[PDB]
Each structure stands twice: as structure tokens, then as C-alpha cells.
């Protein structure tokens, strides 16, 4: 059974936990409970292959930024999440990508750019600007909603495909 | 900050995941999604001390019984869970206690016996029989409901107190 080590990263409040809980448990968490570090081991069928997904739901709080080095060394693919109504979270993406690239000493780390909270009308980051950034990195870009489940399966399955396509 | 490694063990279906998710997320999970291995970190105040709880939600499925060795070696305290409406789950408790005792090579391992699903009218295990088993082990016994939250905080806090006493 092929195991995929996925790490969900991004600024504090973008919806990393809500995305993960939506994927695994099929419901939306309305409450905001800041994460320290949670992990999930889930069996899924992707393109007819039984995959074991090891998902690390990380802290967005900068107080736990020293914890990053270890999960960036062990993680195989990174879901880089920003919120479409949070411009700072979109600017923070570059810092996460640079740190991952440094830790792995590689320009070709499996990554997917995720623009979460696409159900909200309060957009501050244009889809075209996020598309252009993902193109500059050579990575897929997907918009998601942890509330409606729009794009959630696609975001995680695309990351598994990036780890698989890189392999 | 004092860190406590808590491991939730017991038969497949007793409510290990629902107890853990209730404690951390204040949410009851009605669905049955068999666990492989999930972990959570949570900061809590117990008797005026800020505790970091590292909770391991383990597989009840006997298919993953080989995974027990590693978590029984690293775990500091064990929440041994049975369901009050499942006689077999109560019978399985002694196997978990024996395995933990063997791995640790000790009769004094921090443990709490938990009789879950106390909200259900379909009781098959008498509170007195469970109290007697906990007495034979020299451990606390608490009845809980992951649905109503009855005894949930008490079960986890008591386990932390047992680790503190052991130390
Ligand atoms: N409308 C909407 N709200 C969302 C979405 N995803 C998350 N939220 C909300 O945003 C808040 C933060 O979500 P959460 O999943 O805790 O984000 P996080 O990135 O894990 C926060 P931390 O970095 O501290 O762990 C919550 O109120 C949650 O309901 C979404 O797609 N749409
Ligand atoms: N009424 C009631 N139902 C509960 C309670 N705790 C768990 N359940 C239910 O029992 C079922 C199994 O719960 P779950 O948390 O998955 O048990 P588990 O021991 O983790 C199963 P596994 O060992 O395979 O991971 C679920 O349908 C859940 O809603 C409870 O206290 N009261
Ligand atoms: C992705 N993994 C990372 C490790 C994990 C967080 C872990 N924490 C550890 O410190 C540790 C260290 C060595 C082996 C096993 C463990 C686990 C463990 C055992 C007992 C109780 C809690 C618990 N949580 C589980 C999830
Ligand atoms: Mg979170
Ligand atoms: Mg479970």
C-alpha cells in the first residue's frame, strides 16, 4: 500500500483544519480553535490505487514556526493554503514555499496552491493573481471551500498526484 | 510547559474517537469511521497548571494490533475504554491492560478505566462489575458519554493526574 505524507500549511485562520476535517469527516467546523499539531492516517482510493494518506494539520500561529523544519523534512507534498479574503495569507505563501525549498534543498517539491473560503463574497485576492503565482512556481492552483466541499477532494487528490507524478 | 502523552485504547466501536473529538472539538461524531492512527495536541489548564496534552487516538481494529508496541512504549498514560452496552468490549479491557503491563514491564502504569456510552439505555455491563475490575488494577473508573460530554473532561484530567502521581 502506497503511503503519501501530506502537510497542510498556511497562515493562521486560512482554514487548514476546516479543509482537513471536511476531507476526512464530511462536515464543516464553524468554530476557530487554533492548532498546535494534529495528524490523521486515512485510506482513500485515488485513480484506482488504495492510498494511505498521512495528513499533518500544522499551526498557522507564528509562535510555532520553529516546529516547521521537522515536518518540512518528512513531508512529501505540501498543501499551501491561503484564504481568498485575506491578502496577508496570500503574501505569506511565498515564505512557506521558500522555507520548504530550503529544507528539502530542491526547486521541485510536490505542492498545490489552495485559495480557500471561495464561498465568501468578501474576496481580496483575484483568481488571476493566484493563478499567475502558481504558474511562476510551476504548481497547480485550486480554489476551495471547506464549507461547501467545493474543490476539497480535488485539492488533496491533486497533491497526491503531484507526489506520484514527481515519483 | 509540562507535556503528557495520552493514549486512548479499547475495542473497535467503544467510542475512542468520539471521546477524543468531544474533548478537543466540543463536537459529537455520529458516524463510524474506523481509525488507523490519529494524533492531537491540546493546551489545557488542569488544577491551575498549563498542560500540553499529546493524545493518540488508536485503532480498535485487531488488524492494526502490531502498531500497539510503539505507542505502548512511548505512551505515558492510557485511557482504557469499553462501552457499557457492549459486553465483549468490557471483556477486551483485560487484554489491553495485560499488553500495556508487559510492554512497560510494570504493574504501576498510569491508566483510567472508562465506561463509555452511559447516555444509552441498553446497558449490558453493570457499573459494579466495572468498579471491581478498576479496583483489582488499582486505577480510577469513570463513566462517560461522548454524546452529552458527561465525564469526558473528568476522564482525561484524571489520567493526567495519574501521570503526575506516577512521576
Ligand atoms: N466561509 C468559510 N469559512 C471557513 C472556511 N474554512 C475555514 N473557515 C473558518 O475560518 C476560521 C478558521 O478556520 P480553521 O480551519 O480553524 O483555520 P486554521 O488555518 O486551521 C487556524 P490555525 O492556523 O490557528 O490552526 C473558522 O471560523 C472556520 O469556520 C471556508 O472555506 N469558508
Ligand atoms: N450514544 C453514544 N454513541 C457513541 C458514544 N461514543 C461513540 N459513539 C458512537 O459509536 C460509534 C463508534 O464510535 P467511534 O468513536 O468511531 O469508536 P472507535 O472506538 O473510535 C472505532 P475504531 O476502534 O474503529 O476507531 C459511532 O457511531 C459513534 O457515534 C457515546 O458516548 N454515546
Ligand atoms: C505523526 N505522528 C508523530 C508522533 C505522535 C504525535 C506521538 N508523539 C510522540 O512524541 C511520539 C514519539 C515517538 C513515537 C510515537 C509518538 C506518538 C505518541 C505516542 C503516545 C502518545 C501520543 C503520541 N503522539 C503521533 C503522530
Ligand atoms: Mg488549524
Ligand atoms: Mg476511532
Residue numbers in the entry:
A (entry chain A), B (entry chain B): 1 to 167
According to the publication:
KRAS is the most frequently mutated oncogene and belongs to the protein family of small GTPases that function as binary molecular switches involved in cell signaling. Although KRAS could serve as an excellent target for many cancers, no therapeutic agent directly targeting RAS has been clinically approved. The main reason for this is the lack of druggable pockets on the surface of RAS. The shallow, polar pocket situated between the switch I and switch II region of KRAS (SI/II‐pocket) is of particular interest because it is present in the active, oncogenic form of KRAS.
The complementary “kinked” docking pose of 12 b in the SI/II‐pocket of KRAS encouraged us to generate a sub‐library of 1383 rotenoid‐like “kinked” molecules with contiguous fused rings from our corporate database for a second virtual screening campaign. After visual inspection, 7 compounds were selected for NMR testing and the racemic compound 15 showed NMR cross peak shifts. Both enantiomers 15 R and 15 S docked with conserved indole binding modes; hence, the racemate 15 was separated into its two enantiomers 15 R (2R,3S) and 15 S (2S,3R). Enantiomer 15 R was successfully soaked into the crystallography system with the crystal structure confirming the docking pose. 15 R binds to the SI/II‐pocket of active KRAS and forms two chelating H‐bonds to D54 with an N−O distance of 2.9 and 3.0 Å, respectively, and a weaker third H‐bond to the K9 side chain through the carbonyl group with an O−N distance of 3.4 Å. (D) X‐Ray co‐crystal structure of 15 R binding to the SI/II‐pocket of GCP‐KRASG12D. (E) X‐Ray co‐crystal structure of 15 R binding to the SI/II‐pocket of GCP‐KRASG12D in green overlaid with the docking pose in orange. Of these, we confirmed biophysical binding to the active form of KRASG12D for the tricyclic indolopyrrole alkaloid 9 b and the indoloisoquinolinones 15 R and 15 S. Importantly, we elucidated the binding mode by determining the protein–ligand complex structures of 9 b and 15 R with the first X‐ray crystal‐soaking system for the active form of KRASG12D.
